[PDB]
Design a protein around this ligand. Structure first.
Ligand SMILES: CC(C)(C)Cc1[nH]nc2c1[C@](C)(c1ccccc1)C1=C(CC(C)(C)CC1=O)N2
Length: 345
């Protein structure tokens, strides 16, 4: 049974073509609508179709954002197209990838084991790459979690997915506080800040990093507000100057004073010292103090990835790690001296 639709390519001239697919099954769910799997008849390739009720009044924020993006570490919009059920739906044809960082991290910790640190370097490097790219367009993902990191287990290619909460932030225009998933939610946001930057994504990224070294979430909060407490147990009570730097909308938390539990004691003994150094510069109260995604790719914890002889545990080559663009380097072009090593010209 074959379905044919007239779909506009996402990274293409605005020019609709016939597309056919088969083997439709449901795989996903949300306030938005539903996600299906299908097999394209052309390539036999597997894809996901995200089906979203779309008020013809509005543009679809996710769609505008997805049409700009073109990146090895971001899920690609192959096609999009409209359908019926007045009912008008947007369908987004996106990559299907069989695993996630959530699932892999979970296999390791159901077995009490540590995810090998090579994979931590591989996965995190690619996540920071993906954020460098979108942050360069002023786009904040605002939902970085291990579950939104797609993962081809054989190639080690990580792809950032799910841009339902993503947005272009412009200084001046305020934004919602209760955003991101709780465990990965920056403290600015729990203070009610509406004037935040894309450095919230970096907080979340350091939460993913921490989780991958600990085997469970670093801040498992009972509620959007117990989330602060969980954080405070680790970083300790924020100073008056840190609280000011979060440009809050409410500080009346009447929180006890807790001393900072130092970083090296948070992780299991003989965690590599560079992972902790990176981790502490992401999970900072002051949002302006956190590394930019691109400095984070340049960090010395990822040096193993820049070694000429580096290979995956399954024998194969690493994915493309060094093929930076000008768009992708914009925020700090000198970093290319470190980022793109000798042996890749
Ligand atoms: C590109 C989408 C819209 C994000 C769909 C997609 N593309 N590739 C995927 C997905 C799913 C449907 C997804 C949905 C939401 C967030 C992340 C992932 C998905 C997988 C792996 C699993 C094991 C089947 C679990 C699963 O939910 N892989």
């Amino acid at each position: 049974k074959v379905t044919t639709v007239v779909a506009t390519p996402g990274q293409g001239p605005d020019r609709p073509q016939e597309v056919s697919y088969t083997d439709t099954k449901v795989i996903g769910n949300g306030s938005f609508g539903v996600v299906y799997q299908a097999k394209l008849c052309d390539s036999g390739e597997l894809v996901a179709i995200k089906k979203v009720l779309q008020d013809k009044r509005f543009k679809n924020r996710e769609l505008q954002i997805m049409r700009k993006l073109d990146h090895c570490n971001i899920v690609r919009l192959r096609y999009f197209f409209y359908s019926s059920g007045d009912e008008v739906y947007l369908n987004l044809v996106l990559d299907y990838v069989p695993e996630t960082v959530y699932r892999v991290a979970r296999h390791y910790s159901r077995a009490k084991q540590t995810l090998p640190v090579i994979y931590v370097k591989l996965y995190m490097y690619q996540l920071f790459r993906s954020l460098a790219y979108i942050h360069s367009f002023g786009i904040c993902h605002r939902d970085i979690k291990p579950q939104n990191l797609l993962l081809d287990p054989d190639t080690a290619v990580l792809k950032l997915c799910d841009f339902g909460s993503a947005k272009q932030l412009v200084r001046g225009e305020p934004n919602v506080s209760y955003i991101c998933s709780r465990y990965y939610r920056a403290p600015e946001l729990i203070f009610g800040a509406t004037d935040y930057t894309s450095s919230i994504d970096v907080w979340s990224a350091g939460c993913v990093l921490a989780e991958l070294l600990l085997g469970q979430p670093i801040f498992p909060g009972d509620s959007g507000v117990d989330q602060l407490v969980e954080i405070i147990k680790v970083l300790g009570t924020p100073t008056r100057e840190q609280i000011r730097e979060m440009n809050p909308n409410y500080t009346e938390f009447k929180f006890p004073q807790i001393k900072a539990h130092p970083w090296t004691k948070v992780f299991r003994p003989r965690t590599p010292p560079e992972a902790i150094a990176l981790c502490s510069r992401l999970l900072e109260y002051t949002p302006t103090a956190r590394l930019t995604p691109l400095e984070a790719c340049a960090h010395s914890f990822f040096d193993e990835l820049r070694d000429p002889n580096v290979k995956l545990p399954n024998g194969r080559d690493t994915p493309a790690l060094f093929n930076f663009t000008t768009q992708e380097l914009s925020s700090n072009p000198p970093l290319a001296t470190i980022l793109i090593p000798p042996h890749a010209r």
